[PDB]
Copies of this chain bind each other. A is one copy, B any other.
Amino acid sequence: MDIIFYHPTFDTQWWIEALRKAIPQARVRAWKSGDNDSADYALVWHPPVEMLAGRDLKAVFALGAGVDSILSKLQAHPEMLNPSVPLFRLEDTGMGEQMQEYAVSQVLHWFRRFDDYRIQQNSSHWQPLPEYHREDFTIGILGAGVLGSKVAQSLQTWRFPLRCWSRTRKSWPGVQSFAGREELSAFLSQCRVLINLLPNTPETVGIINQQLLEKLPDGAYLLNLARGVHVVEDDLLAALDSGKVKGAMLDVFNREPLPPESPLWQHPRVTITPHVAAITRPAEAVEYISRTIAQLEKGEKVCGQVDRARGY
């Protein structure tokens, strides 16, 4: 087999060599403009149309969890990826645990009122605060996928009430499963903490807006770990200023880097991280890719596969 690799910023030389070692019968090369030699598999992030167009690839592996960008490019350039070509993404490969670290830390942080204690510390003010209780701290997860489920799991340990929202029904024993737009209002109504792990799709763009935030209980918290386009930033600022939302921690933004003019930077109840919630673990990604290729070859049934019609 022949494998072509393209990534705008990764250590191309490291990846190529790691893939050779993990698939020793594989000839692996970095794709450059003009390379129209044969390829069986393509490993890509933000690929040029030229790299894929007209290739009857056996599979394409997106080097990310999200496939927002590549699907949107195929819409604009249908010539780019023949419908025969199966599209895979990176499922977990270490991002699950990273999402769990971030959510558990911050849910507990809000639950123990470390935000209030920091404000009082800023005035040298010593004042014990009433403890919150779990019954009033339901955690809702928008999106119940590879990452949502991992996060739900790691929060169940702490005995918070849990609910999730998705297109289709889930069976997780401790987690009340809400499905479809018809059930979104009910889902939102009890969510003291709302965690966004949705994919970026036309159906979810701007879903976190005024109408959604108004259905939340008062003094809610928002943790956006998914995509910036899910949030209407001005509606969120209004919810923060009205006290509807007590705190928001955001890792992703409509424009990244978030430009200095955004009021989010200096807003008091907002915490910002620069899209670092869960990054690729290269060795685990190389493991997932070689394993998937091996499974495709043995005719075994494989899962981590994008549905282009569905959008994710």
Interface of A toward B, CB cutoff 8 Å: 101-102, 104-106, 108-109, 111-112, 114, 117-118, 120-121, 124, 126-129, 131, 157-158, 256-258, 260, 265-266, 271-276, 279
Cα separation A104 to B108 with both chains bound (whole Å): 8
Asked whether, in the complex, the Cβ of B117 is within 8 Å of the Cβ of A111, the reply is no
Cα separation A240 to B284 with both chains bound (whole Å): 37
Chain B residues near A265 (CB, 8 Å)?
A: 121, 124
Given contacts A265-B124, A266-B124, whether A101 and B105 have CB atoms under 8 Å apart is no
SS class of chain A's interface: helix, strand, loop or mixed?
loop
Asked whether, in the complex, the Cβ of A121 is within 8 Å of the Cβ of B275, the reply is no
Contact with A114, one of B124, B157, B273, B275 (Cβ below 8 angstroms): B273
Cα separation A273 to B111 with both chains bound (whole Å): 14
Q: Which residue of B lies closest to A260 (CB)?
A: B124
Asked whether, in the complex, the Cβ of B260 is within 8 Å of the Cβ of A128, the reply is no
Asked whether, in the complex, the Cβ of A117 is within 8 Å of the Cβ of B273, the reply is yes
Asked whether, in the complex, the Cβ of A276 is within 8 Å of the Cβ of B128, the reply is yes
Q: Closest 6 CB pairs between A and B?
A: A105-B108, A126-B257, A124-B265, A124-B260, A126-B274, A121-B272
Cα separation A14 to B168 with both chains bound (whole Å): 48
Q: Say how far A256's CB is from chain B's closest CB, in angstroms.
A: 8
Cα separation A279 to B117 with both chains bound (whole Å): 16
Chain B residues near A274 (CB, 8 Å)?
A: 117, 120, 126-128
Chain B residues near A276 (CB, 8 Å)?
A: 117, 128-129, 131
Q: Say how far A119's CB is from chain B's closest CB, in angstroms.
A: 11
User: Can you give 28 A-B contacts (C-beta < 8 A)?
Assistant: A101-B108, A101-B111, A101-B112, A101-B158, A102-B108, A102-B112, A105-B105, A105-B108, A105-B112, A109-B109, A114-B271, A114-B273, A117-B273, A117-B274, A118-B271, A121-B265, A121-B272, A124-B260, A124-B266, A126-B256, A126-B257, A126-B258, A126-B274, A127-B274, A128-B274, A128-B275, A129-B276, A157-B157
Cα separation A112 to B114 with both chains bound (whole Å): 17
Cα separation A158 to B117 with both chains bound (whole Å): 26
Cα separation A117 to B127 with both chains bound (whole Å): 27
Cα separation A108 to B273 with both chains bound (whole Å): 15
Q: Which residue of B lies closest to A277 (CB)?
A: B112
